[PDB]
Design a protein around this nucleic acid. Structure first.
Lengths: 155, 197, 227, 61, 35, 60, 129
RNA sequence: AGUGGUGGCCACUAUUAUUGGGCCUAAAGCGGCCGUAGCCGGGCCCGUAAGUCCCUGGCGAAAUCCCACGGCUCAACCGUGGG
RNA sequence: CCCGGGUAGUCCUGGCUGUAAAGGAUGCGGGCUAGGUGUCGGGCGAGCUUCGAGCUCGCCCGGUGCCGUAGGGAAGCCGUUAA
């Protein structure tokens, strides 16, 4: 994470170059479909869904399995949650950032003098706005959609 | 096959290295001990020193210099030079020895023998400035820059010094043909070792 | 020519060889100049080289580049000292440069000449201009650089008859290196003649540092040293 | 530095203690690992290798 | 008012702080009498 | 004029020729003892290994 | 942030050479990079090379033969017609044909001498000698 | 049969720097951070041909410029022919 | 300059003023590049254990030095934390 903290720390994580999924996965594409719809039915976003699936269920990655409905695409959790109407409208990361934004703005309301968190607010707001600008360049949001603290409160 | 018994080697401190390593001698290093001292490879040491014996015979006896500024090696080198007719210089190597013709003891070898690479820096610089091949008695702390024939072992202990110098005399006089068998040396280890006064 | 062999004989039966290299030149095992350089030997007795290249002794083949009067400040006066820099070479790809300290003109001159003899070097030569390409050793075979201090000098092949397009110090060095047409450019100040000379030396040495195919040898006619 | 990055995390075919349940689990879990039937925890996430408590049967790569 | 570091070396010079302050006092009086 | 093409010595552990005043070395091949292994500074200071052309013996 | 594979590749090659190692592993491997690696190998400046599917971007493994004085990437992709190569050649080479230039042309990226023989200009990408 | 003095312009000058300059100690990195336009941007497949490149018609008039030849005694100049 | 006092100041509240040798006198991001060694912090593996990651050793990653090969630079010096 260098883009603001400017520290080149490497806590990233690695995936081996496997092209076909391994054999020891005793579940099939429909079974992982059943489990992922169960999981998101239980109220989890993609990151925690995939973590627990690779953790307790053991399947290393759903990206190693090819979507039946398209030969060129490798199956992903987001696509599956899009299949059944369980993907979210506002992309998950940005919803999280809005939630943290309203959180910090409240704490800041009851605490004006901590300019350190003023700067933090400035940071997280540039973050959300960059993500939103990008997604506008892609068009997965309504074009009139634009940040407001108050609707974030409604969020 | 070993020139000397392995247990003799282990008793001689040949395989005992320091608490340090280097990228250069990762190959020669065998393993580490839980305390910290490093262990060299015995078999590689034996192979390299028999190779060195195969080498040194190709030169003249007198032409080869052997120098040890480390205290523990001075009698091993004098004894080896006596045995093999090589020239030997213990103590403080006079700077400008082979580089300065006006000196009294001017002599230019065709190969060098080095006891401790760290201590014998001056010898290497002189010999290089003459431009000759270099042989070294290295440790897991010595450095492999500017050595044509490095041999790994413990280059501090007196027992190791005498043992390896003895084996070197054995192999050089083997390959020189003056003495064919190993058993013709009636000069045991204690003749090369240091005497504690 | 015959006079050079006479000089070689005079020194041969006068000089007593001390170094390890003195034998193979006095005993005749070595007779090629490039014999010394190839193997990676050393040189310390200047008397060696005139045996194989007595032509260095020619009065014209020795060049005095510059004479500096560097002072030393003492508690009890100003003690001058002559630092003289001079070059000596043959016109077939061997040259050398020397710096000699002294109390008079002569002593510094002699010591500098001896040192320069000791720093003899081999010179590749060719023709790699974009126009001439005549395969002869009438120029540096290809572009090179030489760095010393502030000064960095780049030498570029040129067509024949162009002459030495370079400052006077480089002119003398290249006249005594056996080269006669080259473009030259300099970065850094060239008023300190000593560094200019040393930089040209570095460049000439760097010529041999360039990787080459035999194809290139036959294309520019790369004469390694003596033509 | 290894040219191709090889993961330092393996997978583990393990047997739970209570209900005799086989499972595939991960060496460096980011969260808790629990059994399907009895529900008890299996491996605890920490700064490094997860804290196994059941019996490891086989090591998968 | 972007002070040159070169001027801070006291060789053949007065301490820069005080020259700056002198210029400021002169500025004060000049702007004053102007208006 | 009979052309005087010498064989300029080539270092063994890098393939780069030996510049004239390089203080390089030449010594007999180690394990068999017929090949003249050269060694240049660029291979000496870092002391990268050399492999004999004949016996495949590798060493510094 | 990595932005240009080729320049990092050729710089990595030269920085290996001046040390003079044997094996190099260009992490940013691309099809164009492989074509380039073919180019000078057809003048043997390198030994063999191989592609390795790393699962992310490929990695090219290359042996050196110790024959690269300097290998730089002309970054601003100067387009050049046939008739003026001598100016740009003189811009990046020490002597007459002393090495090569790699040009991307309508037919496929490869060296410059043939491109003169085939008489097709293009866009300079790299130089090496 | 010109030379000298002065003035102004290019080289000298990599002291204007794309080719091709520096910014720790010589003058030169702002106290720090955010980010708009601009500029520079990972790889693979399909298409396009805007750029990029090759060929081809019209056109960029003459005089000046490069080259061979002819006239002026030679030259400069002029003409014819090619760029 | 030393000593005896002494106002504004130095403290809290609200606002302004936008400055310093704010100096590593070193603008930031990526790729490459011999090494030696410590501490800091995270992880892993051995050894110790009065069983507290509580104590010694090896490795990997990030920050922080010191020494240092090649290499740079007028030199001071720098040198994988680059100049």
């Amino acid at each position: 994470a260098r883009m603001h903290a400017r520290k080149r720390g490497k806590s990233g994580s690695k995936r081996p170059p496997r092209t076909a999924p391994p054999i020891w996965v005793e579940y099939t594409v429909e079974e992982i479909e059943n489990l992922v719809v169960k999981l998101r039915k239980e109220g989890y976003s993609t990151a925690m869904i995939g973590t627990i699936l690779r953790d307790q269920y053991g399947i290393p990655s759903v990206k190693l399995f090819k979507d039946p409905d398209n030969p060129n695409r490798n199956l992903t959790i987001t696509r599956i949650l899009e299949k059944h109407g369980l993907a979210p409208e506002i992309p998950e990361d940005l919803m999280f950032l809005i939630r943290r934004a309203v959180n910090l703005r409240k704490h800041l309301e009851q605490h004006p003098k901590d300019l350190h968190s003023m700067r933090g607010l400035q940071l997280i707001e540039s973050k959300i706005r960059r993500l939103v600008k990008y997604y506008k360049r892609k068009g997965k949001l309504p074009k009139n959609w634009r940040y407001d603290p108050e609707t974030a409160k409604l969020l | 096959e070993y020139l000397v018994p392995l247990d003799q080697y282990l008793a001689a401190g040949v395989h005992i290295g320091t608490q340090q390593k280097t990228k250069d001698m990762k190959k020669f290093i065998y393993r580490v001990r839980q305390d910290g001292l490093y262990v060299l490879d015995v078999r590689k040491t034996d192979e390299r020193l028999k190779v060195a014996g195969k080498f040194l015979a190709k030169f003249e006896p007198q032409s080869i210099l052997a120098v040890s500024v480390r205290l523990y090696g001075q009698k091993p080198v004098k004894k080896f030079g006596e045995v093999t007719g090589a020239r030997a210089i213990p103590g403080r190597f006079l700077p400008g020895t082979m580089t300065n013709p006006a000196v009294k003891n001017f002599f230019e070898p065709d190969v060098l023998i080095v006891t401790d690479p760290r201590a014998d820096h001056q010898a290497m610089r002189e010999a290089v400035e003459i431009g000759i091949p270099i042989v070294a008695l290295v440790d897991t702390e010595n450095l492999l820059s500017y050595v044509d024939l490095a041999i790994p072992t413990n280059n501090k202990g007196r027992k190791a010094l005498a043992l390896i110098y003895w084996i070197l005399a054995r192999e050089i006089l083997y390959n020189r043909g003056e003495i064919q068998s190993r058993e013709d040396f009636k000069i045991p280890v204690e003749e090369f070792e240091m005497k504690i006064v | 020519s015959q006079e050079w062999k006479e000089y070689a004989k005079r020194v041969l039966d006068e000089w007593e060889p001390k170094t390890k290299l003195g034998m193979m030149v006095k005993e005749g095992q070595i007779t090629d100049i490039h014999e010394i350089f190839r193997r990676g030997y050393q040189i310390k007795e200047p008397e060696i080289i005139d045996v194989l290249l007595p032509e260095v002794n020619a009065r014209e083949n020795q060049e005095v580049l510059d004479i500096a009067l560097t002072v030393r400040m003492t508690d009890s006066g100003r003690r001058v000292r002559f630092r003289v820099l001079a070059a000596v070479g043959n016109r077939d790809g061997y040259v050398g440069l020397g710096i000699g300290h002294g109390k008079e003109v002569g002593i510094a001159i002699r010591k500098a000449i001896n040192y320069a003899k000791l720093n003899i070097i081999e010179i590749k030569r060719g023709c790699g201009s974009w126009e001439c390409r005549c395969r002869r050793p009438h120029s540096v075979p290809f572009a090179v650089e030489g760095k010393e201090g502030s000064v960095r000098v780049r030498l570029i092949p040129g067509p024949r008859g162009l002459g030495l397009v370079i400052g006077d110090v480089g002119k003398k060095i290249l006249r005594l290196a056996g080269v006669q047409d080259v473009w030259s450019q300099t970065f850094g100040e060239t008023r300190t003649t000593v560094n200019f000379a040393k930089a040209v030396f570095n460049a000439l040495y760097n010529t041999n540092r360039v990787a080459i195919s035999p194809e290139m040898i036959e294309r520019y006619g790369i004469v390694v040293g003596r033509a | 530095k290894p040219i191709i990055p090889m993961p330092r995390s393996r997978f583990l075919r393990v047997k739970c203690i209570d209900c005799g349940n086989e499972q595939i689990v991960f060496s460096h879990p980011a969260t808790k690992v629990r059994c399907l039937i009895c529900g008890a925890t299996l491996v605890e996430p920490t700064g490094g290798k997860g804290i196994v408590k059941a019996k490891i049967l086989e090591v998968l790569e | 008012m972007k002070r040159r570091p070169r001027k801070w070396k006291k060789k053949g010079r007065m301490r820069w702080k005080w020259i700056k302050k002198r210029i400021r006092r002169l500025k004060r009086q000049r702007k004053k009498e102007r208006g | 004029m009979v052309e005087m093409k010498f064989e300029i010595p080539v270092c063994t552990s890098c393939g780069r020729e030996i510049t004239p005043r390089e203080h390089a070395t030449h010594f007999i091949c180690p394990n068999c003892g017929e090949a003249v292994i050269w060694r240049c500074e660029s291979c000496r200071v870092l002391a990268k290994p050399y492999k004999c052309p004949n016996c495949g013996w590798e060493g510094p | 942030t990595l932005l240009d594979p080729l320049a990092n590749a050729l710089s990595h090659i030269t920085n290996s050479e001046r040390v003079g190692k044997r094996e190099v592993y260009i992490k940013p491997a691309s099809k164009l990079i492989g074509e380039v690696l073919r180019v000078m190998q057809k003048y043997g400046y390198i030994g063999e090379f191989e592609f390795i599917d790393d699962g992310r971007a490929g990695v090219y493994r290359v042996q050196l033969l110790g024959r690269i004085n300097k290998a730089g990437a002309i970054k601003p992709r100067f387009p050049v017609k046939v008739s003026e190569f001598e100016k740009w050649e003189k811009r990046f080479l020490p002597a007459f044909e002393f090495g090569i230039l790699i040009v991307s042309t309508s037919q496929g990226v490869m060296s410059h001498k043939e491109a003169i023989e085939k008489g097709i200009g293009g866009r300079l990408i790299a130089y090496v000698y």
